[PDB]
Amino acid sequence: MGNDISLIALLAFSTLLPFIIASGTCFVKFSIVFVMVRNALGLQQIPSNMTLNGVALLLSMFVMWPIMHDAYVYFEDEDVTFNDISSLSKHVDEGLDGYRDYLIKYSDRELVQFFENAQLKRQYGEETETVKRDKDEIEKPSIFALLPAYALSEIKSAFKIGFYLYLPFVVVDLVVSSVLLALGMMMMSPVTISTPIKLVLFVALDGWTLLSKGLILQYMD
Amino acid sequence: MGNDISLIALLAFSTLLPFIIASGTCFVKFSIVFVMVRNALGLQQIPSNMTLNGVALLLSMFVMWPIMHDAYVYFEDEDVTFNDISSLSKHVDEGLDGYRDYLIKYSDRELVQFFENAQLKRQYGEETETVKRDKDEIEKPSIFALLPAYALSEIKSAFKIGFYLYLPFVVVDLVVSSVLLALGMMMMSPVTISTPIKLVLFVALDGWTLLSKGLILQYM
Amino acid sequence: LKEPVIVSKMAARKKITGNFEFHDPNALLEKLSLQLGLIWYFDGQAIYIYD
Amino acid sequence: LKEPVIVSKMAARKKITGNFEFHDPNALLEKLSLQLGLIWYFDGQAIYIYD
Amino acid sequence: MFYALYFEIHHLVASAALGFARVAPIFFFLPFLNSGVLSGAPRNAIIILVALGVWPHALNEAPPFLSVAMIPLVLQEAAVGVMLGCLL
Amino acid sequence: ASEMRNAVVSLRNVSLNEFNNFLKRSGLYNKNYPLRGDNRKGTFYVSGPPVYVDMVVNAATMMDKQNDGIELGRQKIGVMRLNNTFVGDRTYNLRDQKMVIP
Amino acid sequence: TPWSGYLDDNLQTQVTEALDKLAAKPSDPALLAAYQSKLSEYNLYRNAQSNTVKVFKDIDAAIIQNFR
Amino acid sequence: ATPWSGYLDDVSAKFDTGVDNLQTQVTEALDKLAAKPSDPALLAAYQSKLSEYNLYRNAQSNTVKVFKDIDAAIIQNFR
Amino acid sequence: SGYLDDVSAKFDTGVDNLQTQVTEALDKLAAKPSDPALLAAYQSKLSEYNLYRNAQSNTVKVFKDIDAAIIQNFR
Amino acid sequence: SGYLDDVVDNLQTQVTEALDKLAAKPSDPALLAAYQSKLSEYNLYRNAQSNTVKVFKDIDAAIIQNFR
Amino acid sequence: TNRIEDPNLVTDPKELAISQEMISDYNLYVSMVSTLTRKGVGAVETLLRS
Amino acid sequence: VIGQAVNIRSMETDIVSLDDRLLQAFSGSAIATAVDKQTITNRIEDPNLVTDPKELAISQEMISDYNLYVSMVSTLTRKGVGAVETLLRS
Amino acid sequence: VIGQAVNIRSMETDIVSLDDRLLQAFSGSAIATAVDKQTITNRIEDPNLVTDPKELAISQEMISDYNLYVSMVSTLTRKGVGAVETLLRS
Amino acid sequence: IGQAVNIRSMETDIVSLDDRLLQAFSGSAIATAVDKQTITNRIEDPNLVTDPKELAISQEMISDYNLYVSMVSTLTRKGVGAVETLLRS
Ligand SMILES: CCCCCCCCCCCC[N+](C)(C)[O-]
């Protein structure tokens, strides 16, 4: 490296990288959807968490790679670009817009607005006018305000997707329970009978194909 | 120690090894099947996961051993001369084909091809007419395309096997319930009468040997 | 004004309503500055408005 | 044109339709360059086209 | 003053730590946040970020609680968090 | 066919045509994949099946290294009689000055 | 090594020259007095340089070893 | 734009190992000097050769030492 | 600035004028290299200089090593 | 210090004073010989203090980690 | 201290030995609070499940 | 004494986000460092500066101060990162 | 200045798979490294290069740069795999 | 000068997993035992410990030994480290 502080900052970033992936990337969503599927089928320990997180991380790679590559060549670029403190701080800030555009494109506008206003009222005082940017160009919000809005937005949508998948298995369960009561076999635990019907239903749907296709198509046109 | 960047690459690979085994090897399937056997017999804590996984890990080595041996002798034992980026890249890539062919044997083409197009990201949303379900191939897909298609195929296969394994034991206990309702004894649960029957049925079938043998025979 | 105008983020949060002429902009701009609480500078190339 | 053509990853996203006559390619290329917003160069062996 | 940024980072983490005591119980009760769904490395990373998103005071000035017995305080905050978890 | 190898070799002590003679005596030469370069210079390009390429590259490198033990620069001695003048330098002690003719 | 994007040998020849003059007439007091100075300065220059290059190596190494 | 890869002389060095000229010449010069320890023409030669041999041997040792510390530090970084 | 410059300066405010005197004596001597009266004075001044510069540099070295030890024990 | 707030002399003073006296006449052997031993004793004191503070903090860090 | 006395006293060995105590002790205090809160929350979760 | 400047009321009625506080700190440090390295190298190249006791005694202090500053920034940064790891890490 | 080359154009990402870009990066690094090690070794044996003060001042820089390059790569790869361990094992 | 080489040492086919261990273990323990012995008797011999051309060889031998044993240890530890995680998990 040509400069020492440029090196210190790089080692710090490389030391905090995993939490940024755990809280600001689609991995947070894929990881949830697969656990929801396992809950739905009524399984406990199989497939293992290490297998489901393995595929979740691989799939997240196809989606995040382009902006990490873009940032890499942007900071390697050898052409003369900055001279002085204001130009350096603007050069660094400008290099992050490739990722601010990502967070903003998937975060919920209402949450972004909440976390922004609640910071203004910390710094400048609660009497500062509550913005109500109801028709909005959110003026490059701070990333510390933007990041938790993304995290809660992805949790919301992953739960939403997971809900839909239950409904067939719910049907299966209530049907089986009704036919057993119709025969009076009150002492039979339904779960023994209903588990294989769920498995064969999911296999006939080919769930993992449909699901992994759609989850990726949501991120690219 | 040769080239030290090759040394770094070797230690890195050695660190990631258990996740590759956990997500790109038939351990994935054997681990699930044995646990489902325990659930179908309705046992909650015995045999231990320590035992079932130990067995699954052993069995999977027999299947994978032929490939690791070839990769080893190809890379490490043979001294070779190479001199530039392109010659080295080709040399390295050619070594993986022994594993690549296994993945493509057990993976499903339209999904692998989808992931390839997704990582080129070209012209995306290409239609089903851009494909025509061709049959015979000299394509060489990426390994980052092949790994997840493999995982998602193995899991589905395991679920399918688990469908059949449950059936006989489901019959065994509905018969017991019906006989108890033919008598008056509707206050008593089947489970304490039903469990030993399942255990004898399973030993009379010698299910462990038929399972292990048949699981191996698929990969021969 | 015949010059580009740059408004700081903080100053951009205020709202104004009514019907304005802009006949003599340099005078009007000064008057409005003291009513709204703005400060402004002019380097010869662009007008900068801040809170 | 009698030259191999290399098209940038970015420019390859654009689409076109119609019935075209390649009577004088250097001229047609110059025409469409401005209409579509492309830039191009010729080193003597191949034609490179960019956004 | 040279060390001021170092101390300003430590004031931040002390505030986040005392906020976790009040935010985590809510994540225990709600059906879309409990560890039946959200588990592993994401869980703490998200809880901490939320707590920092809602802490009421400027993060860069010394926390006011340095003079107080820590256990009575932590239990107080956890009880408050349990009450909010029930009402939500 | 996809396995074809190619390499550039540079020799300091041995000519291309000298190496050719070695190949021919060996019975290793192959007119389908001959060496390409300047007979008079020491740099050439070769391409072909793996075995042939590897053998060529190794052999040539060893030939060149071993020729660091050979020597070319044998000195010679010429004896030349002067027909019109004395070989030695002379000193003329002028009564006023000593002067030298080398 | 350059910091990417940031905007922004005579003494050797002089010593060689003085050596060549001196070698032709080792007994000239003026050539001796001149060579003594050129050689002394060249010596100091080379030492100061190599000490500084080591000091920078050791700072970069300490930084890496702190996070490693 | 990127600097060229270079090209690798894989075979040459490991079998270029062989008896150095420098040690041979040092021992020869010593054997000439020991026959007549008072000849200035021989002393002047031996001073120079012995000096060069000292520098060469040190430079080599310090280099081997540096290259092997890097490898020990890599392995100790991963275990 | 800094403390090590404070230590360095505590010498230079200690020897008021030596830095000048040495050069002045040198100019005089250079004017008449064979006057024993001049020679005798230059020997003294030059020696006093040599000693001042050595003591200064070794002291700065020692205080540098004390600080470099403490900043390592911060870890 | 001249100050106490209600609610001998140390090596730090003695070194500063002996340096101050020396710098007035850097070439006196009595003063030099008096200063060598004060600078040495100050170097030893200031190392031993920091090394033991470091030991007590690593003890407390290990306790907190052991109960994690 | 904000623009009073002076900055950058990286260098005097007497004040630099006072900073070592504070820089260590505040890091330990902050580390301790992090564990106490986890323990407290874990105790509440333990009782509520059981 | 040459070209002195100080900012006043830095925090009296405006406060920066942490996001910016880190960025300004990084920039103000990185440029000062790069200029100090160039100054040292130039003081070594010039034949009139590496041969005069008065100029060497000045250069020794510059090298000492550079080395102490970069070591202190590195240590504090590493120690401060450690605390965030101990906070986030489950 | 004796012999030099540079690679002017880099291939479009639209035609190259994700693992090709890795193989291609790795190979280039491994070769530039073996070539630097060899160069240094050869400088240490030419008796003209090993005994001239001008040339030694160059060898010292070359060996310091090689050392820093390899320490950098070996550190960042370890951080890289440590992230994967943290996400999957946890 | 008294030297011997054993040539027909190894079988290159695919072979049962149990014996690849025994053959690797045995070949390695043999190599390290002889290497260590030659190192020590290079130090004990007075004609070798005092010649600058010989010392330079001993330096390389010592370093190569150090690295080889460091690497066999590291890879074996990561080998059993994989198994214990797959089984515990
Ligand atoms: C509900 C009827 C259960 C009848 C027993 C089912 C088969 C398992 C036990 C008998 C196996 C036959 N065998 C081997 C004893 O001959």
- How far is it, in rounded angstroms, from Cα L44 to Cα L38? 10
- How far is it, in rounded angstroms, from Cα N88 to Cα A48? 12
Q: To which residue do tokens 């500055």 refer?
A: C33
Give the residue among L60, L59, I7 at the shortest CA–CA distance from J39: I7
CA of B204 to the centre of ligand 1 (A): 7
CA of L57 to the centre of ligand 1 (A): 100
Query: What is the distance of C-alpha B195 from the center of its chain?
Result: 30
The answer for residues whose C-beta is within 8 angstroms of residue M89's C-beta and 6 or more apart is: A50, N85
Ligand 1, closest atom to CA B172?
A: 1
To the nearest 10°, the Cα dihedral for B72, B75, B79, B84? 180
- How far is it, in rounded angstroms, from Cα I42 to Cα I21? 9
Strands M6-7 and H2-3, by their bridges, are: antiparallel
The answer for residues whose C-beta is within 8 angstroms of residue H71's C-beta and 6 or more apart is: B1, B4, B7, N67
- How far is it, in rounded angstroms, from Cα A203 to Cα A200? 5
Do residues I14 and L77 make contact, with C-beta atoms less than 8 angstroms apart? no
Residues of chain L positioned with their CB less than 8 A from the CB of A142: 17, 19
Strands C47-50 and C5-7, by their bridges, are: parallel
Extended beta strands in chain A, E state? none
Do residues M59 and M40 make contact, with C-beta atoms less than 8 angstroms apart? yes
Residue nearest to atom 3 of ligand 1 (CA): B197
Strands F90-93 and F36-37, by their bridges, are: unpaired
- How far is it, in rounded angstroms, from Cα E18 to Cα G25? 86
* Binary contact (L77, A8; C-beta < 8 A): yes
Amino acid symbol at H33: L
- How far is it, in rounded angstroms, from Cα A22 to Cα M86? 10
Residue F40 CB neighbour total at 10 angstroms: 8
Angle, vertex CA A124, rays to CA A122 and CA A129, nearest 5: 100
- Taking the alpha carbons at both ends of chain N, their separation in whole angstroms is 57
- How far is it, in rounded angstroms, from Cα E49 to Cα L10? 28
- How far is it, in rounded angstroms, from Cα B159 to Cα B33? 8
Phi, psi dihedrals of residue B52, rounded to the nearest 5°: -60, -45
- How far is it, in rounded angstroms, from Cα E79 to Cα E85? 10
SS3 per-residue string spanning B146-192: HHHHHHHHHHHHHHHHHHHHHHHHHHHHHHHHHHHHHCCCCCCCCHH
Give A129's DSSP letter: P
Which of L6, L10, L83 shows the shortest C-beta gap to K31?
A: L83
In whole angstroms, how far apart are CA A176 and each of A167, A181, A187, B175, C10? 15, 9, 14, 17, 63
Ligand 1, closest atom to CA B197?
A: 3
Touching pair E, D by Cβ (3+ pairs < 8 Å): no
Do residues A106 and A150 make contact, with C-beta atoms less than 8 angstroms apart? yes
Do residues F16 and F38 make contact, with C-beta atoms less than 8 angstroms apart? yes
Residues of chain G positioned with their CB less than 8 A from the CB of A12: 67
Question: Is the four-CA dihedral B135, B141, B147, B148 of positive or negative sign?
Answer: negative
The answer for residues whose C-beta is within 8 angstroms of residue B171's C-beta and 6 or more apart is: none
Angle, vertex CA K24, rays to CA K21 and CA K26, nearest 5: 105
- How far is it, in rounded angstroms, from Cα I23 to Cα I27? 6
Chains contacting J with at least 3 CB pairs below 8 Å? I, K
Angle, vertex CA B18, rays to CA B15 and CA B23, nearest 5: 130
**Ligand 1 pocket, B22 CB below 6 A?**
no
Query: How close, in Å, is residue A78 to chain G by CA atoms?
Result: 5
H/E stretch holding F60 reads helix F50-66
In whole angstroms, how far apart are CA M5 and each of F9, H1, J31, M42, M54? 18, 10, 65, 21, 26
Q: Is the peptide bond before E42 cis (omega within 30 degrees of 0)?
A: no
SS3 per-residue string spanning H20-37: CHHHHHHHHHHHHHHHCC
Do residues H4 and M6 make contact, with C-beta atoms less than 8 angstroms apart? yes
In whole angstroms, how far apart are CA L14 and each of A93, A125, L6, L10, N41? 21, 11, 17, 8, 76
Burial of E15 (C-beta count, 10 Å sphere; 0-12/13-18/19+)? buried
Which residues on adjacent β-strands are paired with residue A131?
A: none
Among chain M residues, the shortest Cα distance to B84 is held by M31
Residue A103 CB neighbour total at 10 angstroms: 18
- How far is it, in rounded angstroms, from Cα D37 to Cα D33? 6
Extended beta strands in chain M, E state? 6-7
- How far is it, in rounded angstroms, from Cα A176 to Cα J4? 87
Q: Name the CA radius of gyration of chain C, rounded.
A: 11
Q: To which residue do tokens 């995993």 refer?
A: A18
Most E CBs within 10 Å: which of L18, L20, L77, L81, as the mutation test of the E interface?
Answer: L18
Longest dimension (CA), chain G: 61
CA of B211 to the centre of ligand 1 (A): 20
**Ligand 1 pocket, B40 CB below 6 A?**
no
Touching pair L, B by Cβ (3+ pairs < 8 Å): no
What ranges do the domains of chain G cover?
A: 1-68
Residue A206 CB neighbour total at 10 angstroms: 13
Which contacts of A89-94 are long-range, i.e. CB under 8 A and separated by 24 or more positions?
A89/L23, A89/L24, A89/L27, A91/G5, A92/L23, A92/L26, A92/L27, A93/L23
- How far is it, in rounded angstroms, from Cα J40 to Cα N64? 44
- How far is it, in rounded angstroms, from Cα C50 to Cα C38? 6
- How far is it, in rounded angstroms, from Cα N33 to Cα N29? 6
Tokens of A87: 């130009």
Q: Which of residues 21-60 of G touch M (CB under 8 A)?
A: 46, 49-50, 53-54, 57, 60
- Taking the alpha carbons at both ends of chain F, their separation in whole angstroms is 75
The answer for residues whose C-beta is within 8 angstroms of residue A19's C-beta and 6 or more apart is: E41, E45, L88
- How far is it, in rounded angstroms, from Cα I41 to Cα I47? 10
Extended beta strands in B97-164, E state? none
Residue N24 CB neighbour total at 10 angstroms: 11
- How far is it, in rounded angstroms, from Cα L73 to Cα A4? 10
Extended beta strands in H1-79, E state? 2-3
Do residues B133 and B142 make contact, with C-beta atoms less than 8 angstroms apart? no
Give the residue among L17, D48, I11, M58 at the shortest CA–CA distance from A147: L17
Query: What is the distance of C-alpha C27 from the center of its chain?
Result: 11
Q: To which residue do tokens 């020897």 refer?
A: I15
As a residue count, chain L comes to: 90
Query: What is the distance of C-alpha C1 from the center of its chain?
Result: 10
Residue I63 CB neighbour total at 10 angstroms: 22
Residue K31 CB neighbour total at 10 angstroms: 21
Q: To which residue do tokens 């060529």 refer?
A: F56
Which of K9, K13, K24 shows the shortest C-beta gap to I66?
A: K13
DSSP F19-48: HHHHHHHHT---TTS--EE-TTSSEEEEEE
